[PDB]
């Protein structure tokens with residue numbers, strides 16, 4: 001089960017990806033999570049990625065492709081993988097094609113989680129994350145029991161540094177710009193599927209199960 005998740009910022013890739021790997025026995029590989037972990041830990045990768053991420057720009061292709069290639073070579077990817085937020089550009093997709101060709105692990109579905117750009121600011125500015133366990137909430141759409149406090153371990157919730165109006169606007173522009181070309185790229189390959197991401201989380205996941213069961 002070799003999958004790519006794509007979607008505009010806030011469309012629900014992490015939310016769906018976490019659900020997918022809980023059920024299906026494959027690793028969740030998020031380039032955003034990888035970069036942010038590097039930033040949190042102040043590693044050289046973090047220091048390089050930070051100047052781009054803080055502005056809402058894409059990290060350059062060379063390093064991004066490099067870290068994914070190394071990640072996909074690990075034993076935990078032998079039975080499949082869920083790439084979340086990679087590829088994000090046609091160049092990245094072309095590089096990944098070659099990578100997966102030699103592994104004998106070509107993509108089964110590129111899942112485009114479709115969400116109207118007009119609702120994505122609200123998804124992102126309302127996002128809250130636990131400082132302790134990383135569990136994700138939304139102020140309105142998926143709130144904790146006590147505002148500002150995680151249900152699981154009582155950790156304080158915070159707002160991602162890039163989830164402010166200015167940076168979200170940049171992220172949407174940057175990612176929109178790469179979107180139509182990438183959708184066209186995969187559609188021509190034949191395994192792009194669009195899923196309606198503008199439903200309750202449970203209902204988006206239900207639609208996803210109907211497709212993914214064929215790869216179980």
Ligand SMILES: Nc1ncnc2c1ncn2[C@@H]1O[C@H](COP(=O)(O)OP(=O)(O)OP(=O)(O)OP(=O)(O)OP(=O)(O)OC[C@H]2O[C@@H](n3cnc4c(N)ncnc43)[C@H](O)[C@@H]2O)[C@@H](O)[C@H]1O
Nearest residue numbers: 009010011012013014015031032057059085088127138141
């Ligand atoms: N390949 C690459 N190349 C170059 N640079 C790269 C790169 N990959 C990463 N980068 C760099 O790293 C940065 C960060 O990347 P990344 O962390 O991937 O940011 P992103 O793609 O903007 O996506 P998010 O993580 O913000 O949103 P999501 O789709 O995961 O939504 P979530 O499920 O959390 O949901 C969001 C909110 O909505 C809520 N929600 C989810 N689903 C629903 C629903 N169905 N209804 C209502 N609310 C919902 C959630 O509770 C939550 O509050 C990039 O900006 C770039 O700088």
Ligand SMILES: [Mg+2]
Nearest residue numbers: 013014030032
């Ligand atoms: Mg995410």
Ligand SMILES: [Zn+2]
Nearest residue numbers: 130133150155
């Ligand atoms: Zn927590």
